[PDB]
Design a protein around this motif. Structure first.
Motif, short mmCIF file in Angstrom:
data_model
loop_
_atom_site.label_atom_id
_atom_site.label_comp_id
_atom_site.label_asym_id
_atom_site.label_seq_id
_atom_site.Cartn_x
_atom_site.Cartn_y
_atom_site.Cartn_z
N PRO A 40 -81.18 14.67 -85.26
CA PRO A 40 -81.08 16.26 -85.33
C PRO A 40 -81.23 16.60 -83.74
O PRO A 40 -81.34 15.68 -82.81
N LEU A 41 -80.98 17.93 -83.54
CA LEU A 41 -80.67 18.47 -82.22
C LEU A 41 -82.05 18.48 -81.39
O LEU A 41 -82.08 18.08 -80.12
N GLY A 42 -82.99 18.51 -82.08
CA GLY A 42 -84.43 18.36 -81.47
C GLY A 42 -85.31 17.23 -81.16
O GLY A 42 -85.62 16.86 -80.08
N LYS A 43 -84.66 15.85 -81.93
CA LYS A 43 -84.96 14.61 -81.66
C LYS A 43 -84.16 14.16 -80.40
O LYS A 43 -84.66 12.90 -80.01
N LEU A 44 -83.05 14.50 -80.13
CA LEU A 44 -82.14 13.86 -79.20
C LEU A 44 -82.80 13.98 -77.56
O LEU A 44 -83.40 15.12 -77.49
N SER A 45 -83.08 12.99 -76.67
CA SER A 45 -83.73 13.02 -75.48
C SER A 45 -82.58 12.48 -74.34
O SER A 45 -81.89 11.39 -74.70
N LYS A 46 -82.98 12.84 -73.33
CA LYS A 46 -82.20 12.30 -71.96
C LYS A 46 -82.63 10.62 -71.86
O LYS A 46 -81.57 9.83 -71.43
N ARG A 47 -83.84 10.11 -72.26
CA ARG A 47 -84.27 9.09 -72.22
C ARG A 47 -83.28 8.10 -73.12
O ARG A 47 -82.81 7.02 -72.62
N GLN A 48 -83.15 8.42 -74.42
CA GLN A 48 -82.24 7.58 -75.37
C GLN A 48 -80.74 7.55 -74.94
O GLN A 48 -80.10 6.59 -75.24
N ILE A 49 -80.05 8.57 -74.43
CA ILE A 49 -78.73 9.01 -73.96
C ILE A 49 -78.37 8.17 -72.94
O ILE A 49 -77.48 7.23 -72.97
N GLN A 50 -79.38 7.92 -71.90
CA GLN A 50 -79.31 7.23 -70.71
C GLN A 50 -79.39 5.84 -70.96
O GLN A 50 -79.05 4.70 -70.27
N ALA A 51 -80.09 5.57 -72.11
CA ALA A 51 -80.47 3.95 -72.72
C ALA A 51 -79.17 3.37 -73.43
O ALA A 51 -78.83 2.25 -73.25
N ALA A 52 -78.44 4.18 -73.94
CA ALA A 52 -77.29 4.12 -74.61
C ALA A 52 -75.88 4.01 -73.76
O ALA A 52 -75.22 3.23 -74.18
N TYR A 53 -76.15 4.62 -72.69
CA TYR A 53 -75.34 4.26 -71.33
C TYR A 53 -75.30 2.95 -70.84
O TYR A 53 -74.26 2.23 -70.36
N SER A 54 -76.57 2.54 -70.93
CA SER A 54 -76.90 1.22 -70.36
C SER A 54 -76.56 0.09 -71.22
O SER A 54 -75.93 -0.98 -70.60
N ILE A 55 -76.28 0.25 -72.57
CA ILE A 55 -75.80 -0.88 -73.37
C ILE A 55 -74.26 -0.41 -73.33
O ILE A 55 -73.69 -1.74 -73.49
N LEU A 56 -73.66 0.45 -72.98
CA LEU A 56 -72.10 0.61 -72.89
C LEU A 56 -71.53 -0.31 -71.69
O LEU A 56 -70.71 -0.95 -71.80
N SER A 57 -72.59 -0.42 -70.61
CA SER A 57 -72.51 -1.19 -69.38
C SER A 57 -72.53 -2.84 -69.62
O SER A 57 -71.96 -3.68 -68.99
N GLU A 58 -73.17 -2.88 -70.72
CA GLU A 58 -73.52 -4.23 -71.12
C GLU A 58 -72.51 -4.81 -72.06
O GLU A 58 -72.09 -5.78 -72.06
N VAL A 59 -71.94 -3.75 -72.77
CA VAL A 59 -70.47 -3.96 -73.56
C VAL A 59 -69.57 -4.40 -72.63
O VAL A 59 -68.67 -5.25 -72.84
N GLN A 60 -69.33 -3.68 -71.51
CA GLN A 60 -68.49 -3.63 -70.33
C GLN A 60 -68.37 -5.22 -69.82
O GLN A 60 -67.33 -5.70 -69.79
N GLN A 61 -69.59 -5.60 -69.33
CA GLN A 61 -69.60 -7.00 -68.88
C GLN A 61 -69.57 -7.92 -70.04
O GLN A 61 -68.99 -8.98 -69.55
N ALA A 62 -70.01 -7.80 -71.21
CA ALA A 62 -69.82 -8.86 -72.25
C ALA A 62 -68.20 -9.13 -72.45
O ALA A 62 -67.94 -10.41 -72.65
N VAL A 63 -67.22 -8.06 -72.44
CA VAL A 63 -66.12 -8.22 -72.64
C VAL A 63 -65.22 -8.97 -71.27
O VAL A 63 -64.48 -10.07 -71.48
#
Ligand code: UHB
Length: 350
Positions: A36-59
């Motif tokens: 929901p709109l209430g449950k999303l935080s900057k902590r988890q969005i920034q954590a999802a961004y770090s996972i994207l950089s882990e995906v980047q180096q994995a490739v």
């Protein structure tokens, strides 16, 4: 009751529209029941961004199928998605990382808007619209409909609306003279540096809460450079129609917001084709993507020492170029000073 004028009050209502934040998430296929709109935080969005950089180096490191599968799960755990019967697209290809990075960018903007709208000191005496207006740290004033600066702006909209963008028709509802806190003192070392231009910037309504509270930001150096035609910088146009395509509007939601900013271009680096680098040669301050059509330079005026290219679209004479229209890019946030904000009605031709 509120001391702000009705166009400013309606503007606050647009910037903090919870339903438009939700509408944008459903478009990006995010499961609202799980996220929901209430449950999303900057902590988890920034954590999802770090996972994207882990995906980047994995490739890049050519990691196993197991490593790729793990990261896809790690991501979809933090950002739940509703595809229904459809299998979730695996995070393996560079375009998948590009798509999700562009989604996370817009989702972080929705979070900032919701954190502001909900957060803050709760006082009974003050009006909700008046409290939300304060949160933006921006001075918003209504520009008189029959003033000279209004006519300059209307002529700039009328003349620079291209023929290739014949999908819609632009109509100006309100003009707002915006003043972001500290933006002027920050712009000051560039405030007299030659080639200052009044340029357009179109964006999604949801982003505007963050644009006013933080100012046009340059992409994080962590994000993939592939999606940036002229690298990680702030893009602008001298044609309203080019910028208006970025407003993200439809027959359902025909109201969009566009900006007019004083851009200290300086000595521009004229480029015909794309370069994903954000590094300029010695003595260059900006990038001018040379387009096939330019506003007539003979009609260029000087509103408060700033060039207003409100000429009619004419051929630039530029041979073999990828761009149809000019685009201006600055690689320093301090080179921008947001002067106006327009409320436009798109009359979709059918
Ligand atoms: N502080 C901020 N808070 C919230 N959103 C913010 C923000 N600063 C910028 N944004 C918004 O994020 C987006 C962004 O940076 N992006 C996505 C787009 N991408 C390419 C780009 O700028 N293209 C591009 C090219 C030519 C003209 C225009 C644009 C965009 N708008 C125009 O008028 C560059 C990176 C963009 O839509 C902008 O409006």
């Amino acid at each position: 009751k509120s001391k702000l004028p009705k166009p400013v009050q309606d503007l606050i209502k647009m910037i903090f529209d919870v339903e438009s934040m939700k509408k944008a998430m459903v478009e990006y296929e995010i499961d609202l029941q799980k996220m929901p709109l209430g449950k999303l935080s900057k902590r988890q969005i920034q954590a999802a961004y770090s996972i994207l950089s882990e995906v980047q180096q994995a490739v890049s490191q050519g990691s196993s199928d197991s490593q790729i599968l793990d990261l896809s799960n790690r991501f979809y755990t933090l950002i739940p998605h509703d595809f229904g019967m459809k299998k979730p697209p695996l995070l393996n290809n560079a375009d998948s990382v590009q798509a999700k990075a562009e989604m996370l960018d817009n989702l972080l903007d929705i979070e900032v808007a919701y954190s502001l709208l909900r957060g803050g000191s709760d006082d009974s005496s003050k009006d909700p619209i008046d409290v939300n207006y304060e949160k933006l740290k921006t001075d918003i004033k209504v520009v008189d409909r029959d003033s000279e600066e209004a006519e300059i702006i209307r002529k700039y909209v009328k003349n620079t609306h291209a023929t290739t963008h014949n999908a819609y028709d632009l109509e100006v509802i309100d003009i707002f003279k915006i003043e972001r806190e500290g933006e002027c003192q920050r712009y000051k070392p560039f405030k007299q540096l030659h080639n200052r231009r009044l340029l357009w910037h179109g964006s999604r309504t949801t982003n505007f809460a963050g644009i006013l509270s933080q100012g046009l930001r340059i992409a994080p150096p962590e994000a993939p450079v592939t999606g940036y035609m002229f690298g990680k910088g702030i893009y602008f146009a001298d044609m309203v129609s080019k910028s208006a395509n970025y407003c993200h509007t439809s027959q359902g939601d025909p109201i969009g917001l566009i900006l007019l900013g004083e851009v200290a271009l300086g000595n521009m680096y004229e480029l015909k084709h794309a370069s994903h680098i954000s590094k300029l040669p010695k003595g260059k301050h900006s990038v001018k993507g040379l387009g096939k059509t330019t506003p007539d330079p003979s009609a260029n005026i000087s509103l408060d020492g700033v060039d207003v290219p409100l000429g009619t679209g004419i051929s630039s004479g530029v041979n073999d170029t990828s761009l149809l229209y000019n685009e201006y890019i600055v690689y320093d946030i301090a080179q921008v000073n947001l002067k106006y904000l327009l409320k436009l009605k798109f009359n979709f031709k059918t």
